Coordinates of C-alpha atoms and ligand atoms in Angstrom, one line a residue:
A1 CA -148.5 44.6 61.1
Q2 CA -150.7 46.7 63.6
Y3 CA -148.2 49.2 64.6
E4 CA -148.8 50.8 68.1
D5 CA -146.7 53.2 70.5
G6 CA -144.8 51.0 72.9
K7 CA -144.9 47.9 70.8
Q8 CA -142.7 48.0 67.5
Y9 CA -141.5 51.7 68.5
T10 CA -141.7 54.2 71.2
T11 CA -142.0 57.9 70.9
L12 CA -139.3 60.6 72.3
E13 CA -140.5 62.9 75.0
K14 CA -138.6 65.7 73.4
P15 CA -138.1 65.3 69.8
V16 CA -134.6 66.2 68.2
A17 CA -134.2 69.0 65.8
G18 CA -131.9 68.7 62.8
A19 CA -131.6 64.9 63.4
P20 CA -130.4 62.2 60.8
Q21 CA -133.4 60.9 59.1
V22 CA -132.3 57.4 60.5
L23 CA -129.8 57.1 63.0
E24 CA -128.3 54.1 64.3
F25 CA -126.2 53.8 67.5
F26 CA -123.8 50.8 68.3
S27 CA -120.9 49.4 70.0
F28 CA -118.2 47.0 69.2
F29 CA -118.7 45.5 72.5
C30 CA -122.4 45.0 72.2
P31 CA -123.5 41.6 71.7
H32 CA -126.9 42.2 70.1
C33 CA -124.8 44.7 67.4
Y34 CA -122.8 41.8 66.5
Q35 CA -125.6 39.8 65.6
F36 CA -127.0 43.0 63.9
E37 CA -123.8 43.0 61.4
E38 CA -122.8 39.7 60.9
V39 CA -125.8 37.8 60.6
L40 CA -128.9 39.6 60.4
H41 CA -127.4 42.5 58.2
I42 CA -130.1 45.3 59.8
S43 CA -128.6 48.4 58.2
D44 CA -128.2 46.7 54.9
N45 CA -132.0 45.7 54.9
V46 CA -133.2 48.9 56.1
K47 CA -131.4 50.8 53.5
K48 CA -132.7 48.2 50.9
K49 CA -136.4 48.7 52.0
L50 CA -136.1 52.7 52.3
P51 CA -136.1 54.7 49.2
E52 CA -133.1 55.7 47.8
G53 CA -131.7 59.3 49.2
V54 CA -132.9 58.4 52.7
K55 CA -129.7 59.5 54.9
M56 CA -128.5 56.6 56.9
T57 CA -126.4 57.3 60.0
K58 CA -124.3 55.3 62.2
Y59 CA -122.8 56.3 65.2
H60 CA -120.5 54.4 67.9
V61 CA -121.1 54.9 71.7
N62 CA -119.1 55.2 74.8
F63 CA -120.5 53.5 77.6
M64 CA -119.4 50.1 76.9
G65 CA -115.7 48.7 77.1
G66 CA -113.9 51.3 79.7
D67 CA -110.8 52.7 78.1
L68 CA -111.1 50.8 74.9
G69 CA -114.7 51.9 74.4
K70 CA -113.6 55.5 74.0
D71 CA -111.0 54.8 71.8
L72 CA -113.0 52.7 69.4
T73 CA -115.6 55.7 69.2
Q74 CA -112.4 57.8 68.0
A75 CA -111.5 54.7 65.8
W76 CA -115.2 54.9 64.5
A77 CA -114.7 58.7 64.0
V78 CA -111.6 57.9 61.9
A79 CA -113.6 55.2 59.6
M80 CA -116.5 57.7 59.1
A81 CA -113.6 60.5 57.9
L82 CA -112.0 58.2 55.8
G83 CA -115.2 56.4 54.6
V84 CA -113.8 53.1 55.5
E85 CA -116.6 51.9 57.7
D86 CA -117.3 49.0 55.5
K87 CA -113.6 47.9 55.6
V88 CA -113.5 47.8 59.3
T89 CA -116.7 46.8 61.1
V90 CA -116.2 43.3 60.9
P91 CA -112.5 42.9 62.1
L92 CA -113.4 45.0 64.9
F93 CA -116.5 43.1 65.9
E94 CA -114.5 40.3 65.6
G95 CA -111.4 41.5 67.2
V96 CA -113.2 42.5 70.3
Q97 CA -116.0 39.9 70.7
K98 CA -114.7 36.7 68.9
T99 CA -110.7 36.5 69.0
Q100 CA -110.5 39.2 71.9
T101 CA -107.2 40.1 70.4
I102 CA -108.4 43.8 70.4
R103 CA -107.2 45.1 73.7
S104 CA -105.5 48.8 73.1
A105 CA -105.7 51.6 70.6
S106 CA -102.6 49.6 69.1
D107 CA -104.4 46.7 68.2
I108 CA -107.1 49.0 66.8
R109 CA -104.5 50.6 64.8
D110 CA -103.2 47.1 63.4
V111 CA -106.7 46.1 62.2
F112 CA -107.3 49.5 60.1
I113 CA -103.6 48.6 58.7
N114 CA -104.4 45.0 57.9
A115 CA -107.7 46.7 56.2
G116 CA -105.6 48.2 53.7
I117 CA -105.4 51.8 55.3
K118 CA -102.2 53.2 55.2
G119 CA -100.5 53.7 58.8
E120 CA -99.7 57.6 58.3
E121 CA -103.1 58.1 56.9
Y122 CA -104.7 56.3 59.9
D123 CA -102.2 58.2 62.3
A124 CA -103.2 61.8 60.9
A125 CA -106.9 61.0 60.9
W126 CA -106.7 59.7 64.5
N127 CA -104.9 62.7 65.8
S128 CA -107.3 65.3 63.5
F129 CA -109.6 67.9 64.6
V130 CA -112.2 66.5 61.7
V131 CA -112.2 63.3 63.7
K132 CA -112.0 65.2 67.3
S133 CA -115.5 66.8 65.9
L134 CA -116.8 63.6 64.7
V135 CA -116.3 62.0 68.5
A136 CA -118.3 64.9 69.8
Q137 CA -121.1 64.6 67.4
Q138 CA -121.4 61.0 68.3
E139 CA -121.7 61.9 71.7
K140 CA -123.8 64.8 71.6
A141 CA -126.2 62.7 69.4
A142 CA -126.4 60.0 71.9
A143 CA -126.9 62.8 74.8
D144 CA -129.6 64.3 72.7
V145 CA -132.0 61.2 72.7
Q146 CA -131.2 60.1 76.2
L147 CA -129.5 57.1 74.7
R148 CA -129.3 54.4 77.5
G149 CA -128.4 51.3 75.5
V150 CA -127.7 49.7 72.0
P151 CA -128.4 48.7 69.4
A152 CA -130.7 51.5 69.1
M153 CA -132.3 53.2 65.9
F154 CA -134.1 56.6 65.9
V155 CA -136.2 57.9 63.0
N156 CA -136.6 61.7 62.3
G157 CA -135.4 62.5 65.7
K158 CA -138.8 61.3 67.1
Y159 CA -139.1 57.5 66.9
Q160 CA -137.1 54.7 68.7
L161 CA -137.3 51.4 67.1
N162 CA -138.3 48.7 69.9
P163 CA -136.8 45.3 68.7
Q164 CA -137.7 43.9 72.2
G165 CA -141.3 43.4 71.0
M166 CA -140.6 42.1 67.6
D167 CA -140.8 38.4 66.7
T168 CA -137.7 36.0 67.5
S169 CA -138.4 32.7 65.9
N170 CA -137.0 33.5 62.5
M171 CA -134.3 35.9 61.9
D172 CA -135.7 36.8 58.6
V173 CA -138.6 37.6 60.0
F174 CA -137.3 39.6 62.8
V175 CA -135.3 41.5 59.8
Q176 CA -138.4 42.2 58.0
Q177 CA -140.3 43.5 61.0
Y178 CA -137.5 45.7 61.9
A179 CA -137.2 47.1 58.5
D180 CA -141.0 47.4 58.0
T181 CA -141.3 49.4 61.3
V182 CA -138.6 51.8 60.3
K183 CA -140.3 52.1 56.8
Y184 CA -143.6 53.0 58.7
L185 CA -142.1 55.4 61.1
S186 CA -139.9 57.2 58.0
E187 CA -143.5 57.8 56.4
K188 CA -145.2 59.1 59.6
Ligands
SFQ1 O1 -131.4 38.1 71.9 C1 -132.5 38.5 72.3 O2 -133.4 38.1 73.3 C2 -133.1 39.7 71.6 C3 -134.6 39.8 71.8 C4 -135.1 40.7 70.9 C5 -134.3 41.6 70.2 C6 -133.1 41.3 70.0 C7 -132.6 40.2 70.6 N1 -131.0 40.4 70.4 S1 -130.3 39.7 68.7 O3 -130.4 41.2 67.9 O4 -129.0 39.1 69.0 C8 -131.2 38.7 68.1 C9 -132.5 39.1 67.2 C10 -133.3 38.3 66.7 C11 -133.0 36.8 66.7 I1 -134.0 35.7 65.7 C12 -131.9 36.3 67.4 C13 -131.0 37.2 68.2

């Protein structure tokens, strides 16, 4: 591939210090994010292409879904705190976008319970200051990169993926171009 700024990626005006090596932003209300998870598995394939030991971080954003959107950001903090991201990502995505059965914080709770998280453990985490901190962290991270939309990925707080410029004739080619760009940028 011929990598060029503005094609597969763009460069931040003011790079973020102390930024995660690979940082993804998403929303459970975000249509492309649903595809990134369910059929493209972008995170898995980026992880596969990168060396073992490269930190990948994924944060949820507020600016989609109204009142429930903020709650999902807090719910994602709970998932990060308890380490059950892989347990709840699919039922949260489908609960919002597919079945539309997630309409309030109580429905989010039901999802965690059904995924095997004990109710008392969820409630303690939901109300915890560790989780409050994680919400603040997610919000600050987005502000630091002037985040305007999702899905989004940032490499070393300096480069932003540009999927719009990649080939969309074939799902696996799209994933290959995306992952290979992340690899290229990580070595940059
Ligand atoms: O759906 C689009 O138009 C699109 C264009 C560029 C990048 C992402 C897009 N959305 S998507 O993630 O749902 C998607 C990506 C690759 C393929 I093939 C189909 C959909």
